Design a protein around this ligand. Sequence first.
Ligand SMILES: CC(=O)N[C@@H]1[C@@H](O)[C@H](O[C@@H]2O[C@H](CO)[C@H](O)[C@H](O)[C@H]2O[C@H]2O[C@@H](C)[C@@H](O)[C@@H](O)[C@@H]2O)[C@@H](CO)O[C@H]1O
Lengths: 315, 310
Amino acid sequence: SKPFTLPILTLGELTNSRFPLPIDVLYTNPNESAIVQCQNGRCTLDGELQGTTQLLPTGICAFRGKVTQQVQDEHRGTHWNMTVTNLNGTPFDPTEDVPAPLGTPDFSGQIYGVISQRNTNTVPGEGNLPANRAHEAVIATYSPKFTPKLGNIQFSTWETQDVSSGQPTKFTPVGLASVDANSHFDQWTLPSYSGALTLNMNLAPSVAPVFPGECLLFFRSFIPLKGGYGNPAIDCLMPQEWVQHLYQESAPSLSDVALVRYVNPETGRTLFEAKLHRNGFLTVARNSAGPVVAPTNGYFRFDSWVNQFYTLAPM
Amino acid sequence: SKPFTLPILTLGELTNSRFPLPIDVLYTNPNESAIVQCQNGRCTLDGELQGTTQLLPTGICAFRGKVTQQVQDEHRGTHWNMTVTNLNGTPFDPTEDVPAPLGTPDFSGQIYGVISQRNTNTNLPANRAHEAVIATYSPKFTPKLGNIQFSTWETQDVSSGQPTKFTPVGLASVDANSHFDQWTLPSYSGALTLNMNLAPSVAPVFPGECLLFFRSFIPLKGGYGNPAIDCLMPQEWVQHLYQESAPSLSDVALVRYVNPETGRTLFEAKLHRNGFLTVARNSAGPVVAPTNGYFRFDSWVNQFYTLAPM
Ligand SMILES: CC(=O)N[C@@H]1[C@@H](O)[C@H](O[C@@H]2O[C@H](CO)[C@H](O)[C@H](O)[C@H]2O[C@H]2O[C@@H](C)[C@@H](O)[C@@H](O)[C@@H]2O)[C@@H](CO)O[C@H]1O
C-alpha cells in the first residue's frame, strides 16, 4: 500500500477550497450549533472527491454558461438569467450523482464578482475578432432563481443594459456583496440547488467530532466585501492543495483516523497535534473559539495511523 | 536520488501560472519574434522558484497595500496611488534578490480587476470594493520601488490609509492604446531603470523545435479581441516541482503526452531544466488532443536528442 502523505506547505502557502482566497488562520468554534456539511473542499484521505468539489482553484464558486435574457425581479438592480454548463463547457447532465455542477457555491449569501462575455460571432473588419464586455455582478444563492442543478441561475448588475443575450458568459467570484441581515449570509446553510422547496441530493456527508473534548479545526479565510460593515470569513475543512494532493496520491487509508502534528520548521518542535479523519476533516482537543495563534510558516506533518480511541494532547 | 515526476493532471485540471485562469489548450507559435522571458510560472525542474513566482494561485497578478493619494485623470476616471507590500502583508524589501514583489504581473497591458478594502478601525469595520485597472506599462507602475497606481470609474469612494487588495479578473482592453504585449516585461522600477534578478529567457536551441505553451484565454472589460496568456508550465507543475525538489539528472527531460484510455503516446516533448517545453512542430496554433491526455516523464536525455515530429 502506497504510504499516506500530506503536502509540505505552510499556512502562507495554502488556499481555501470554498472560495478563491488564501488561508489566513486556523480556527475553531466548538459551540457551533449548525450542521457542518459544506460541499466544496470535500475529499476523502484516499482521494475521492465528494459534493461539488473539483480540482481547479479557478473553478471554486465559478460559473460558465450563456445569458438568456434580462428578467424581472422585485429586488433592486438589473437581473439576468443565465444557463450554466459544466466548467469545462460540456452540458451539465442533471442525472449525474452530484448536487449541482462542480464548483457551484456551497453557502447562502450574496456572492459578488464579475460577469464577463466574449461573443461567439466575429467581425471580419475587426480581424475576425469578437466583441466583449464585463460588469460587476451579484449571485444571491438563497434566491428561488438560484437553480444550478436545473442548469440555470440569475445574477444582478449595477449596469442597466450592457449584458448580451445568447453569448458565452463567465462568472469570476471576488467576495460578498453584503453581510447585513437582509443578505442572508450563512456559511453553513446550503443553497437549494434545484430551487425553492426542493430537497438537495448527492451531498457529501456532515462532519463532527465524536470524541469528548474535541472540536473541528478549520482553515479560515477572510472574504472581501463590496460594501457595508463586517469582517466575514469562510472556513474550509481542508485547503485546496490538500484536495489536489489526496486526489493525486490516492493512498489507501489504513485506519479511520490519521494522526498529524503541526510543526514549526525553524524550531522543529510540535505546536499541537490533530486527528485527520478518513472523510477529510480535522479535529483537535481545544475548548475555545477563535484563531489558532501560531506562525504561518507552520505545517501539518503526517505521523501515523491511529484510531478513534486515540486521546489528543490538549492545545 | 529521488525520481523526477510530473503531476497526473489533464489539461482540464490545470491552471495558468501567469494569470488566474484554467488552461484552455496547448499552443505553439514558431515564428514568434519576441524574447520569451516571463517571470511568473518560473520554476526549475529541481524546485527552485525564479522571477516573481510564488505558490498561491490567488497570488498571481495580485497586490496588497494601502492607498495614499487620489489623482484625477486629465479627461476621464480617477487614479489612486498605492503603496504595496508583500502578499503576506510584510513590508517589501527592495534589497531582496527578486525583480518585484512575488506575484507582480509580468506583462505589459491594462489589467482589469477589483480593488477591495477592509478598514483597520472600528465594532465591525467598513468595507468597499470597485472595479479597477492597473496599467503595467505606466511610468507610475513601480512595484520594485514599493508603489503603483490603479485607476477606477468610481470617482470618490476609495479610502486612504486602509488595507487594500487587488483581485485580478482580466484585461481592460487590447486596443492599440492599451499596450497589451504578453512578452514585454514591465519596468518594475520605472522606465529608465534596468529590471533585475530576472528568470532567464527561454528558447529552443535545436532546429525544427519551438516552445510549447499552456494557453488560457483572458476576459476583457470591453472592446474587440480574443486575448490569451501563454505560460511555460501550469501553476500545478510549479507547486509539484517545489514540493518534490527531485535532482535533475540531465538538462533535458523527455516527456510523453499520453491518452490514458488507449495508453497511446500522442506526441513527445523536451522538458528543459529551467522549466519550459519544446516540441518538434513547424506550425502555429492549438494542439488538437483528446481531453484525457496528460504529460508523463519518460527519461533524461540531452540537448542533442531528436524529438519525434508532431
Ligand atoms: C458610463 C460608463 O462607464 N459606461 C461603460 C462603457 O463605457 C463601457 O463600454 C466600453 O467603453 C470602453 C471605453 O474605452 C470602450 O468604448 C469599449 O469598446 C466599451 O465596451 C463596449 O465594447 C463593444 C465592442 C461592445 O462589446 C459593448 O457591449 C461594450 O460595452 C461598458 C463596458 O465596459 O461599461 C459601461 O458601463
